[PDB]
Amino acid sequence: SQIRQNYSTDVEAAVNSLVNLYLQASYTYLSLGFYFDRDDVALEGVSHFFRELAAAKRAGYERLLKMQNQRGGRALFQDIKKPAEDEWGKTPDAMKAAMALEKKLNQALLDLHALGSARTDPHLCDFLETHFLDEEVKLIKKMGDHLTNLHRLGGPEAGLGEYLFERLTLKH
Amino acid sequence: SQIRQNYSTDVEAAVNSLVNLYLQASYTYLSLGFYFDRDDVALEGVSHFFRELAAAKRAGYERLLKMQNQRGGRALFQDIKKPAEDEWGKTPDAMKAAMALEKKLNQALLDLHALGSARTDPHLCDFLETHFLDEEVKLIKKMGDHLTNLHRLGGPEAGLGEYLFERLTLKH
Amino acid sequence: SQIRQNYSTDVEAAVNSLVNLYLQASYTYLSLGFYFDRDDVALEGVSHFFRELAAAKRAGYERLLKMQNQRGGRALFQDIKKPAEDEWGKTPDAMKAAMALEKKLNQALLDLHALGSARTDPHLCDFLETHFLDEEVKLIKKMGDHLTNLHRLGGPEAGLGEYLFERLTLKH
Amino acid sequence: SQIRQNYSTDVEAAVNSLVNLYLQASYTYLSLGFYFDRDDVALEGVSHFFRELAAAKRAGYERLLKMQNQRGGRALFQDIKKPAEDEWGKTPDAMKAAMALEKKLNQALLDLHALGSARTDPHLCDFLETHFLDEEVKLIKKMGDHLTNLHRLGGPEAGLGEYLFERLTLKH
Ligand SMILES: [Fe+3]
Ligand SMILES: [Fe+3]
Ligand SMILES: [Fe+3]
Ligand SMILES: [Fe+3]
Ligand SMILES: [Fe+3]
Ligand SMILES: [Fe+3]
Ligand SMILES: [Fe+3]
Ligand SMILES: [Fe+3]
Ligand SMILES: [Fe+3]
Ligand SMILES: [Fe+3]
Ligand SMILES: [Fe+3]
Ligand SMILES: [Fe+3]
Ligand SMILES: [Fe+3]
Ligand SMILES: [Fe+3]
Ligand SMILES: [Fe+3]
Ligand SMILES: [Fe+3]
Ligand SMILES: [Fe+3]
Ligand SMILES: [Fe+3]
Ligand SMILES: [Fe+3]
Ligand SMILES: [Fe+3]
Ligand SMILES: [Fe+3]
Ligand SMILES: [Fe+3]
Ligand SMILES: [Fe+3]
Ligand SMILES: [Fe+3]
Ligand SMILES: [Fe+3]
Ligand SMILES: [Fe+3]
Ligand SMILES: [Fe+3]
Ligand SMILES: [Fe+3]
Ligand SMILES: [Fe+3]
Ligand SMILES: [Fe+3]
Ligand SMILES: [Fe+3]
Ligand SMILES: [Fe+3]
Ligand SMILES: [O]
Ligand SMILES: [O]
Ligand SMILES: [O]
Ligand SMILES: [O]
């Protein structure tokens, strides 16, 4: 590659791998979005929430692909694994799956930062620090706050709580 | 008729019949509207909802009458049957009646489309596809979502649920 | 399903299947987009073209999922197969792959319309006629025009032709 | 120095050295700029391109000098070596020299980041990551794309290609 400089084959491949993980996360949020729009689930604000996250994850993989091209890497695509569930349960259930997905993405970002740090690749490191790491932290914090409010709204009176949460916390 | 072309007497008569069904549906929504405005029911957002539907149904029969005249058909009017109930119960009860009415209207639209398809009358078919069929589907979906939220708000704590739903979902 | 009406299990399943085909088409256009952005391909207007198509295909599957929910269907997701190529060749090569993909999507839309016509499902038919069929026809025509201009720019002097086409036809 | 803190004499000296390298790069782009403005070269867009880079490199050394003063370092200036060529050839030739210069600057930035990382100097590191490293990567990618388009426009018909490239890619 005429442009490649300080860009290890390991990072290149781990970037391709993180791309597939963003693709799959996007796909998982697509499924969660349409799930909460089902006439028998009918929680519009929950649906909007997961739909925004599909979009955000798509921006992530688009940014990883762009950086791949900028460093002289070559994208390679693999199959995107279908989401882990077909039916997502109640808002708390779904929010827990989302939390678990985001922790997985955050761990992959941290592992990739470790890798690029090990190959003394500071461009790759700060790319992750600037466009990914703070976004994950903010988003995980938000999901935690959501889980805390669902839990406080939970238990015996849980149908009402899920309604209120969707109406009063989730936008629209 | 100097203008009539490709317009079967069967469609003409089924159009007159669907007009009476829209008239009766309009009438049913009138009754539901004023019912939820009673001082001892007092759910303004529910009342507004059913009042908007009376208006929407009236637009439907006005459009059917206009098309009747445009094709060279002749309108004939029959008595409009009074609504099936005088008292409509609680929001879920009323919403179920509305769902059942809309399914009946949708079945009549589908039967009329089948008929006009059988008389190879594509103008009539696409008139229904453009001005009626998508409206029914959207409206049925909405009523289903409503029923799902009333159900989740239902059971022991149902008075509070009906209040919240009217305040937080139904506009005004 | 409390809302489902005139919505066959066959259409439901063929809709789920067409969703996966749009997902895979989107994915193929993603790969084509980043491919033409490689420092050693470097045809920005070609890249923009395929990137817009990824977005358009994504709008398609989002619309299919929305309609699925509106009719009372249930989305089911399968793995998304990786694109057929890793490297896409020259502009004419890529444009031919795109043409072939769009013909496949158009054939699937036509087969689904045939199916829904066979189950006398006019809502499904006109949904496809309104949001899909004309879009395919316009897009195929455009791809054909592109192929005709690449061909006229082709042969011995082909490097120059690909440059001119990207600069003077493809926007930016 | 009353302000100096965590600022090694090695970084200080390597900063002075990188300043001279930016000064010399600026000087090289000055020469390339006026070269493409010669009546017998006459490629205005190529000239503008290299002139903008002289300016960009000057901003770099001005920023390095400012940071030097901010950390309590002392600037020391050495002779600026004349550019390596008097005559720069054709657009591809010049673009290759520019690529080679930018790779040299990028290697010096990476070496300085390694150094400041070794002296645990995170201010210096992030200064480079924020104001230098991404700029180099973007600029190298652009130069690569340029070289790819010149190459595709090259060979037998090369005079025409250089004209088109200057007119249709290079701004003005
Ligand atoms: Fe939001
Ligand atoms: Fe399961
Ligand atoms: Fe399941
Ligand atoms: Fe940093
Ligand atoms: Fe860092
Ligand atoms: Fe928002
Ligand atoms: Fe929003
Ligand atoms: Fe709303
Ligand atoms: Fe309203
Ligand atoms: Fe009764
Ligand atoms: Fe009664
Ligand atoms: Fe039609
Ligand atoms: Fe039709
Ligand atoms: Fe209670
Ligand atoms: Fe309204
Ligand atoms: Fe209103
Ligand atoms: Fe009020
Ligand atoms: Fe465009
Ligand atoms: Fe192959
Ligand atoms: Fe290949
Ligand atoms: Fe049709
Ligand atoms: Fe020639
Ligand atoms: Fe455009
Ligand atoms: Fe555009
Ligand atoms: Fe451009
Ligand atoms: Fe410029
Ligand atoms: Fe020489
Ligand atoms: Fe010389
Ligand atoms: Fe750093
Ligand atoms: Fe400019
Ligand atoms: Fe300029
Ligand atoms: Fe000029
Ligand atoms: O939102
Ligand atoms: O409304
Ligand atoms: O575009
Ligand atoms: O420029």
mmCIF file of N, CA, C and O and ligand atoms in Angstrom, chain B residues 126 129, chain C residues 126 129, ligand 12:
data_model
loop_
_atom_site.group_PDB
_atom_site.id
_atom_site.type_symbol
_atom_site.label_atom_id
_atom_site.label_comp_id
_atom_site.label_asym_id
_atom_site.label_seq_id
_atom_site.Cartn_x
_atom_site.Cartn_y
_atom_site.Cartn_z
ATOM 1 N N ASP B 126 -58.024 0.789 -7.461
ATOM 2 C CA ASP B 126 -56.944 1.653 -6.989
ATOM 3 C C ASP B 126 -57.479 2.825 -6.154
ATOM 4 O O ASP B 126 -56.785 3.293 -5.255
ATOM 5 N N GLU B 129 -57.461 1.341 -2.926
ATOM 6 C CA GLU B 129 -56.101 1.084 -2.433
ATOM 7 C C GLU B 129 -55.429 2.373 -1.932
ATOM 8 O O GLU B 129 -54.673 2.322 -0.963
ATOM 9 N N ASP C 126 -50.216 -3.129 -3.345
ATOM 10 C CA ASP C 126 -50.052 -1.709 -3.649
ATOM 11 C C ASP C 126 -48.917 -1.081 -2.828
ATOM 12 O O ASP C 126 -48.277 -0.145 -3.300
ATOM 13 N N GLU C 129 -46.177 -1.681 -5.008
ATOM 14 C CA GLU C 129 -46.260 -0.895 -6.246
ATOM 15 C C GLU C 129 -45.857 0.570 -6.012
ATOM 16 O O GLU C 129 -45.252 1.178 -6.894
HETATM 17 FE FE FE E 12 -52.509 -0.255 -7.587
#
